[PDB]
């Protein structure tokens, strides 16, 4: 398995993608966190796909480095 120290977050709400760069998900999904683009958007992965999603839609479980 990937290490338990892999940055990740829990979706608190559904997010449906409205462009082809966004990573959609459903409430409760555990998203692999890969980057923070700005004060509003993360990048991450779920089920092998990658894309952007709102910081405000998730609960951090393991934070990216600061
Ligand atoms: Cl620290």
UniProtKB/Swiss-Prot annotation:
Domain of life where this protein originates: Eukaryota
Signal peptide: none
Subcellular location: Cytoplasm; Membrane; Early endosome; Presynapse
Sites of Phosphotyrosine modification: 13
Domain commentary: An N-terminal amphipathic helix, the BAR domain and a second amphipathic helix inserted into helix 1 of the BAR domain (N-BAR domain) induce membrane curvature and bind curved membranes. The BAR domain dimer forms a rigid crescent shaped bundle of helices with the pair of second amphipathic helices protruding towards the membrane-binding surface.
Other notes: The N-BAR domain binds liposomes and mediates dimerization of BAR domains upon liposome binding. It induces formation of tubules from liposomes as well as fusion of liposome tubules. Cells overexpressing Sh3gl2 show no effect on transferrin uptake.
Complex formation: Monomer; in cytoplasm. Homodimer; when associated with membranes. Interacts with OPHN1. Interacts with SYNJ1. Interacts with DNM1. Interacts with MAP4K3; the interaction appears to regulate MAP4K3-mediated JNK activation. Interacts with PDCD6IP. Interacts with ATXN2. Interacts with ADAM9 and ADAM15 cytoplasmic tails. Interacts with BIN2. Interacts with TMEM108. Interacts with ADGRB2.
Sequence similarity: Belongs to the endophilin family.
Known function: Implicated in synaptic vesicle endocytosis. May recruit other proteins to membranes with high curvature. Required for BDNF-dependent dendrite outgrowth. Cooperates with SH3GL2 to mediate BDNF-NTRK2 early endocytic trafficking and signaling from early endosomes.
Protein name, per record: Endophilin-A1
Organism annotation: Rattus norvegicus (Rat)
Native organism taxonomy: Eukaryota, Metazoa, Chordata, Craniata, Vertebrata
């Amino acid at each position: 398995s990937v290490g338990s120290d892999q940055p990740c977050c829990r979706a608190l709400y559904d997010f449906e993608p409205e462009n082809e760069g966004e990573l959609g998900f459903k409430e409760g999904d555990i998203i692999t966190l890969t980057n923070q683009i700005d004060e509003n958007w993360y990048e991450g992965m779920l089920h092998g796909q990658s894309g952007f999603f709102p910081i405000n839609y998730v609960e951090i479980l393991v934070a990216l480095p600061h």
